Design an enzyme around this catalytic site. Structure first.
Site, PDB file in Angstrom:
ATOM      1  N   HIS A 100      -3.347   1.835   6.853  1.00 46.90           N
ATOM      2  CA  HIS A 100      -3.454   1.678   5.396  1.00 46.90           C
ATOM      3  C   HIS A 100      -3.044   3.021   4.976  1.00 46.90           C
ATOM      4  CE1 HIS A 100      -4.801   0.968   1.523  1.00 46.90           C
ATOM      5  NE2 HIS A 100      -5.993   1.419   1.437  1.00 46.90           N
TER       6      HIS A 100
ATOM      7  N   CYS B 101       0.647  -1.288   0.066  1.00 49.91           N
ATOM      8  CA  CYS B 101      -0.141  -0.059  -0.139  1.00 49.91           C
ATOM      9  C   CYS B 101       1.011   1.220   0.200  1.00 49.91           C
ATOM     10  CB  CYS B 101      -1.076  -0.046   0.993  1.00 49.91           C
ATOM     11  SG  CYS B 101      -0.411   0.114   2.697  1.00 49.91           S
TER      12      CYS B 101
HETATM   13  N1  LIG Z   1       0.546  -0.964   5.592  1.00 50.01           N
HETATM   14  C1  LIG Z   1       0.599  -1.657   4.316  1.00 50.01           C
HETATM   15  C2  LIG Z   1      -0.744  -1.410   3.603  1.00 50.01           C
HETATM   16  C3  LIG Z   1      -1.980  -1.977   4.194  1.00 50.01           C
HETATM   17  C4  LIG Z   1      -3.107  -1.850   3.675  1.00 50.01           C
HETATM   18  O1  LIG Z   1      -3.109  -2.158   2.260  1.00 50.01           O
HETATM   19  O2  LIG Z   1      -4.228  -1.871   4.211  1.00 50.01           O
HETATM   20  C5  LIG Z   1      -5.835  -1.937   3.441  1.00 50.01           C
END
Ligand SMILES: *NC[C@H](*)CC(=O)OC
Ligand code: NA
Lengths: 219, 75
Positions: free
Chosen positions: A155, A89
């Protein structure tokens, strides 16, 4: 199903503006840096032009029920890659931001330029798998380095202006979310900051685990 | 003495501290109130990121000073 062809593991990335700055450079792009917002509505006139925000929050399942736009501009105007694996992400948010820049201070460099040129006419999910399987991008990502169902995953998402619209680029979605229309004499950042405050209302007043960064012209 | 630690979202965390407390001790108190481990915390006073082994007094932090706390969370 596309995740089955995803190769290599991706590390998690700390929400640190120095790190996101070095990632932009590691991808080959010049002209930009990342500055942290210490308070959500702090004064940011000295940061401008702001090219985009990167916002981190603890992902809640209620995100699934978010109503999204059916605006034509989302299809015609915006570059978007959907994640195929979870831990990408940070890089996915950052590349979704950068591939929507057209600004005299930004130079994507040959790696991201050719990547954009290759993936620009592909479906967003395929754009994502291409990102995930890029050894160059994965290498840079990992050099700086969990069940959604349990709501303990942090996220990264991206906010960026394109034409007269402002978009939330959340790589779990199949498409960008158009938040609203700016201007002609308006400030696009107000639309993003509003959306970020709306997301924060999903939580109790005792959630403090957020980070906000601005991608700005280098200084 | 009291100090105030503010956050991104506008929350204020009040702490009872001694002028000779270390930054690390301050982070521990915040974990007591808010449950965030010290490794996820960066504390800021006057635009400076505060280092764990130094004391409040090294930074000229006084009775009723305000600091900010920004998060370093792995996403
Ligand atoms: N922190 C790594 C990505 C996390 C993610 O895609 O959460 C939805
Ligand atoms: Na440019």
């Amino acid at each position: 199903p596309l995740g089955s062809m995803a190769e290599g593991n991706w590390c998690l990335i700390e929400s640190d503006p120095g790190i996101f700055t070095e990632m932009i450079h590691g991808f080959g792009c010049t002209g930009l840096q990342v500055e942290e917002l210490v308070v959500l509505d702090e004064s940011i006139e000295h940061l401008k032009p702001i090219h985009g925000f990167i916002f981190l929050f603890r992902w809640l399942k209620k995100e699934m029920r978010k109503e999204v736009d059916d605006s034509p501009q989302t299809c015609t105007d915006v570059y978007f890659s959907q994640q195929v694996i979870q831990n990408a992400c940070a890089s996915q948010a950052l590349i979704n931001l950068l591939l929507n820049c057209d600004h005299p201070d930004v130079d994507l460099g040959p790696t991201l330029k050719e990547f954009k040129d290759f993936t620009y006419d592909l479906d967003s999910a395929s754009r994502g798998l291409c990102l995930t399987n890029s050894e160059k991008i994965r290498a840079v990502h990992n050099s700086f380095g969990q069940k959604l169902d349990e709501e303990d995953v942090f996220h990264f998402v991206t906010y960026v202006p394109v034409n007269d619209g402002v978009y939330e680029l959340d790589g779990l979605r199949a498409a960008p979310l158009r938040l609203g229309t700016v201007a002609s004499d308006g400030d696009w950042t107000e639309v993003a900051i509003k959306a970020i405050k709306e997301k924060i209302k999903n939580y109790g007043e005792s959630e403090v685990r957020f980070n906000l960064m601005a991608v700005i012209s280098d200084q | 003495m009291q100090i105030f630690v503010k956050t991104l979202t506008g929350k204020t965390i009040t702490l009872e501290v001694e002028p000779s407390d270390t930054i690390e001790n301050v982070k521990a108190k915040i974990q007591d109130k808010e449950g965030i481990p010290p490794d996820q915390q960066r504390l800021i006073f006057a635009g400076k990121q505060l280092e764990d082994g130094r004391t409040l007094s090294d930074y000229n932090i006084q009775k009723e000073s305000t600091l900010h706390l920004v998060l370093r969370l792995r996403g």
